[PDB]
Amino acid sequence: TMALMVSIMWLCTQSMLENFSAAVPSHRCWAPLLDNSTAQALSPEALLAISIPPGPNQRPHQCRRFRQPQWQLLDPNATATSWSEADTEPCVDGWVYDRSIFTSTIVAKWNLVCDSHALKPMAQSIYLAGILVGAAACGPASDRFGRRLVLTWSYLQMAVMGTAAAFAPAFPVYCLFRFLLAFAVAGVMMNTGTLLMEWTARARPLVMTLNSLGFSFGHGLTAAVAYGVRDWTLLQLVVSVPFFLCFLYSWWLAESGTLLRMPGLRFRTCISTLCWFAFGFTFFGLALDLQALGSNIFLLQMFIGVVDIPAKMGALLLLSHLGRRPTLAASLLLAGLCILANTLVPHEMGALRSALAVLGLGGVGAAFTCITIYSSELFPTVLRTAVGLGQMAARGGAILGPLVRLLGVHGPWLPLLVYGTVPVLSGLAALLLP
Ligand SMILES: O=c1[nH]c(=O)c2[nH]c(=O)[nH]c2[nH]1
């Protein structure tokens, strides 16, 4: 059990790595008055103000630059914002990034900025699509080639794709490498889950809670690892290297039907699929943009893990001491209300915002535990593949999760508004379960 726990722990730091590898630093247009020693100087902040027009949040524009240094806005006797927008350039000479927090990221290497800001959520969507494809293809592969052969193949693919993406020279090559890595990640996830549930199980909820707690420890692991390197290349390298060593376990150290959904329990099937879709949506939408949910990313991830562990412990305790429907409804309602308060609290209260975000990210994990336990009891053994269809719909919702972040252009509250309104409807639907 410890081996598979360490495996899923590294799986967590290989899957949620997009939080740190795709983190966006403060960026702006390349300017000859600021990035060239020939004309660099008066106060530097005044140079930044007169060389780049003010953008959103009263900060310098993330992508804009004046044609000439506008001295007309430096003197206080003249009103601000008097410049015309016709004299602006959309970073015609390149971009610059603040290396104070992160020394190198995929956003700073391939210029994932305003003109192509959709690429990072598109990258997460491609990663989740690779997850879906791997989960859909691991079935026949594991059923034909064996349960350990597919494990070894997934480990080898993970290691190869990790060491390849660590040195990706282009964005499409990196996207393909991440697609294959997500394929292998989903394959090994399904293999670990089935190997645990078939061999370790009466204690099925205990083993499931242990596996998901190892996954939660993966969050603290990825936080502690990203706090050290802060370089996406070295990060990917040191995160993908242990799989090639775990591949030594090959051969144990060298040998020492959803068609019945309509005639069956239609209500249970649709409600379970809705709850799984909601879990996937909310989790893979919130667990990939922690930079906007709090003030510090590493501390946020550490708190997320150190609250998810006891939150999951209490969720298991309440599921053992009470029915699965009331605990699931309560967890879903709590997560929804927490995310709604998180998108409703003003941005200045960063500590309270981060606390609400951690509470919601613990509540969604508790709801995942409840739906995982309830999938094995909602349907008889003849219909129990219901859990497979549920997990597939969860992956499908996790695919569309990051795509909602594209709606941030209309408003920064709308993605979080959706991520808070979805669990409310999920709980209201689960409240009707028999
Ligand atoms: O404990 C889990 N956390 C997840 O984020 C996740 N995603 C998935 O597909 N299965 C699981 N299991």
Author numbering: 21 to 61, 67 to 226, 228 to 282, 338 to 465, 467 to 516
Question: Could you give the paper's own sentences about this structure?
Answer:
The human urate transporter 1 (hURAT1) plays a critical role in urate homeostasis by facilitating urate reabsorption in the renal proximal tubule, making it a key target for gout therapy. The human urate transporter 1 (URAT1) is a crucial member of the SLC22A subfamily, which includes both organic anion transporters (OATs) and organic cation transporters (OCTs). The overall architecture of URAT1 comprises three distinct regions: the transmembrane domain (TMD), the extracellular domain (ECD), and a predicted intracellular helical (ICH) bundle, which was not resolved in our structures. The TMD of URAT1 displays a characteristic Major Facilitator Superfamily (MFS) topology, consisting of 12 transmembrane helices arranged in two pseudo-symmetric halves: the N-terminal domain (NTD, TM1–TM6) and the C-terminal domain (CTD, TM7–TM12).
The density maps clearly showed urate bound within a pocket formed by residues from transmembrane helices TM5, TM7, TM8, and TM10. The urate molecule primarily engages in π-stacking interactions with phenylalanine residues F241, F360, F364, F365, and F449. Additionally, a polar interaction between urate and K393 further stabilizes the binding, as evidenced by the substantial decrease in transport activity upon K393A mutation. Interestingly, we observed that S35 in TM1 forms a water-mediated hydrogen bond with urate. While transporters like OAT1 typically employ a combination of phenylalanine and tyrosine residues to create their substrate-binding aromatic cages, URAT1 exclusively utilizes phenylalanine residues. These features impose stringent selection criteria based on substrate polarity and size, contributing to the high substrate specificity observed for URAT1.
